[PDB]
């Protein structure tokens, strides 16, 4: 009955919000990441890091507001409040982009905390820890995109800024500079996310339309009982229906629900791998066969070459405002443009 | 060709800044999330029916009448993971929720393409922020616009003879 | 000396075969363009 | 097209080795029951 156990006792009490040992890491870090984002989006500028306005205070709306990344000149500085850049000055710290690192790092440690929470509760309750395992997928994405990617580049500046439209810009950057749509690891992620949404919708609909009649009312929700032993819908009729509409169907409820975990988890993991390649500018940018033929044959044209022209438009038209530290000056006459436009 | 189509759409309609597309992403991301959640909750609460040396899947026999997992255990774990009243204990509600979220999200995104077809485009905040003198103060919307512009001026580079690409 | 008691039979059912062949073939279909480059 | 010659062998093995492995385990599974 030492103090350690007394604390364990208290941390693991059944209450409206379970705390647990993982609570000690989760709750401060989750609350700080989230408070930093609301604080910066309400009050803090990106004028000195990006030449952008980015808070409600400056005139931005929910779509355009963001906690932006530090200036390229910070490199990968941890940008600690007490560090050599801001030197304890809260105000300067904000102005130099210190809230980005605050949010990214407290967020990483909250994610760990949350995954430890899934592990802690699963152990206390007596269930298998497959929900913690599935949550590895979000983690991979977050670390690869917000940490590994800009660590392979010149600075945090080129990580995603925390904002709706800042993220849209990140999407478009990756098309023009990395040709990310062409990347087979992104395509595998696409198929996992879309395949996940499909599975989600097809499994819910199927259950709802093979229900057993277990009550008299037109509202069928009332006729389930959390503790009934009986399946509430017919796997058998569900299986014949899909075998006859689609050719194949699930027959194993256990396989089905594992497949539902497997598909979206795997796809997110594949896309994380691809982003690690782009950390290094290791892109699937080109097909060498196409380029050789196109250079020699001015009549040969594909959707592959058309999209590279668009990427070239993107880079030159957005680079100078998007990378202000580079002092890109592109006089009118060097901008790629088609006819009239 | 799919990618071509979606790049040119963005240039001409600013689909990313359109709410119906944002609801599509929410329907698709949320769908993948709830797919993973539901599959991991059922999978976590399967009732021991097998040994270590065999697929747990053999613990369910096609057409058995008893359920193959403990939903009260799944509820009890997920309710504590968040809080009790944000977890489903009614399997009918839960499975209807699975169905409606990505169906509705994707209706909206289909509606997005269908209404942008009539050139009612995404929000335009280009130069919405200016200073006391009237200098433009850029935002992320303006950066997005520099990208859209590069797409605009390069797409179908021999097919425009006049300054506005009106269709 | 005894024969080793830890030996176990291995199984792959027909559905798992179909699933796995589809995976490989579709993986091959996706990456072949990049192998040829 | 001027295409990577080894792409062919790479594709064939990529298909063949994993596929052959599955068939081996399937057929010896059927021969048990």
């Amino acid at each position: 009955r030492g103090w350690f156990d007394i604390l364990d006792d208290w941390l693991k009490r059944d209450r409206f919000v379970f705390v647990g040992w993982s609570g000690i890491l989760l709750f401060p870090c989750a609350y700080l990441a989230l408070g930093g984002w609301l604080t910066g989006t309400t009050f803090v500028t990106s004028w000195y890091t990006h030449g952008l306005a980015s808070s409600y205070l400056e005139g931005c709306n929910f779509l355009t507001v963001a906690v932006s990344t530090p200036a390229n000149s910070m490199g990968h500085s941890l940008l600690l409040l007490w560090g050599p850049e801001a030197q304890g000055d809260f105000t300067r710290w904000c102005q130099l982009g210190g809230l980005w690192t605050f949010i990214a790092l407290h967020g990483a440690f909250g994610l760990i905390g949350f995954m430890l929470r899934q592990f802690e509760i699963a152990r206390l309750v007596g269930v298998r820890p497959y929900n913690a395992i599935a949550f590895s997928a979000p983690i991979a994405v977050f670390v690869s995109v917000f940490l590994i990617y800009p660590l392979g580049q010149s600075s945090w500046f080129f990580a995603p800024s925390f904002g709706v439209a800042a993220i849209f810009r990140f999407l478009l950057f990756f098309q023009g500079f990395h040709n990310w749509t062409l990347n087979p690891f992104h395509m595998m992620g696409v198929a996992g996310v879309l395949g996940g949404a499909l599975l989600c919708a097809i499994h819910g609909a199927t259950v709802e339309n093979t229900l057993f009649q277990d009550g008299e009312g037109a509202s069928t929700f009332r006729a389930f009982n959390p503790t009934q032993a009986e399946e509430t819908y017919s796997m058998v009729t569900a299986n014949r229906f899909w075998s006859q509409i689609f050719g194949i169907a699930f027959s194993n409820k256990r396989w089905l629900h594992f497949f539902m975990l497997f598909v979206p988890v795997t796809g997110l993991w594949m896309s994380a791998i691809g982003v690690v390649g782009l950390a290094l500018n290791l892109r699937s940018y080109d097909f060498i066969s196409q380029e050789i033929r196109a250079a020699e044959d001015p009549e040969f044209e594909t959707f592959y070459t058309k999209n590279l022209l668009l990427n070239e438009g993107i880079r030159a038209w957005m680079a100078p405002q998007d990378q202000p530290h580079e002092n890109f000056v592109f006089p009118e006459e060097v901008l790629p443009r088609g006819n009239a436009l | 060709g799919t990618f071509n189509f979606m790049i040119v759409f963005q240039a001409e309609h600013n689909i990313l800044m359109h709410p119906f597309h944002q609801l599509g992403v929410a329907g698709v991301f949320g769908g993948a999330l709830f797919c993973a959640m539901h599959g991991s909750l059922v999978t976590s609460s399967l009732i021991r029916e097998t040994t270590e040396t065999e697929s747990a899947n053999y613990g369910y026999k096609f057409g058995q009448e008893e359920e193959t997992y403990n939903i009260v255990a799944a509820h009890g774990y997920f309710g504590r993971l968040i809080f009790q009243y944000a977890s489903f204990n009614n399997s009918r509600s839960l499975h209807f929720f699975l169905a409606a979220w990505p169906v509705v999200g994707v209706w909206f995104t289909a509606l997005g393409i269908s209404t942008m077809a009539f050139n009612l485009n995404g929000f335009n905040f280009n130069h919405s922020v200016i200073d006391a003198k009237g200098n433009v103060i850029n935002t992320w919307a303006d950066i997005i616009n520099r990208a859209n512009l590069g797409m605009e001026v390069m797409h179908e580079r021999n097919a425009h003879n006049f300054p506005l690409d009106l269709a | 000396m005894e024969p080793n008691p830890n030996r176990q039979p291995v199984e792959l059912n027909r559905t798992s075969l179909y699933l796995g062949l589809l995976l490989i073939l579709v993986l091959a279909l996706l990456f072949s363009s990049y192998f040829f480059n | 097209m001027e295409v990577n010659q080894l792409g062919l062998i790479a594709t064939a093995l990529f298909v063949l080795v994993p596929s052959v492995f599955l068939i081996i385990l399937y057929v010896q599974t059927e021969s048990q029951q």
Binding site: I248 | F62 | Y18, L29 | -
Partner: peptide, 30 residues
């Protein structure tokens, strides 16, 4: 040779479809 490879793989998938549907493990009740 690339054309033949692409089409060969696509043809194997279609064959696989055929067997997965008409030559499936037939699901049996309980």
């Amino acid at each position: 040779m690339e054309t033949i490879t692409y089409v060969f793989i696509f043809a194997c998938i279609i064959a696989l479809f055929f067997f997965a549907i008409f030559f499936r493990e037939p699901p049996r009740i309980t």
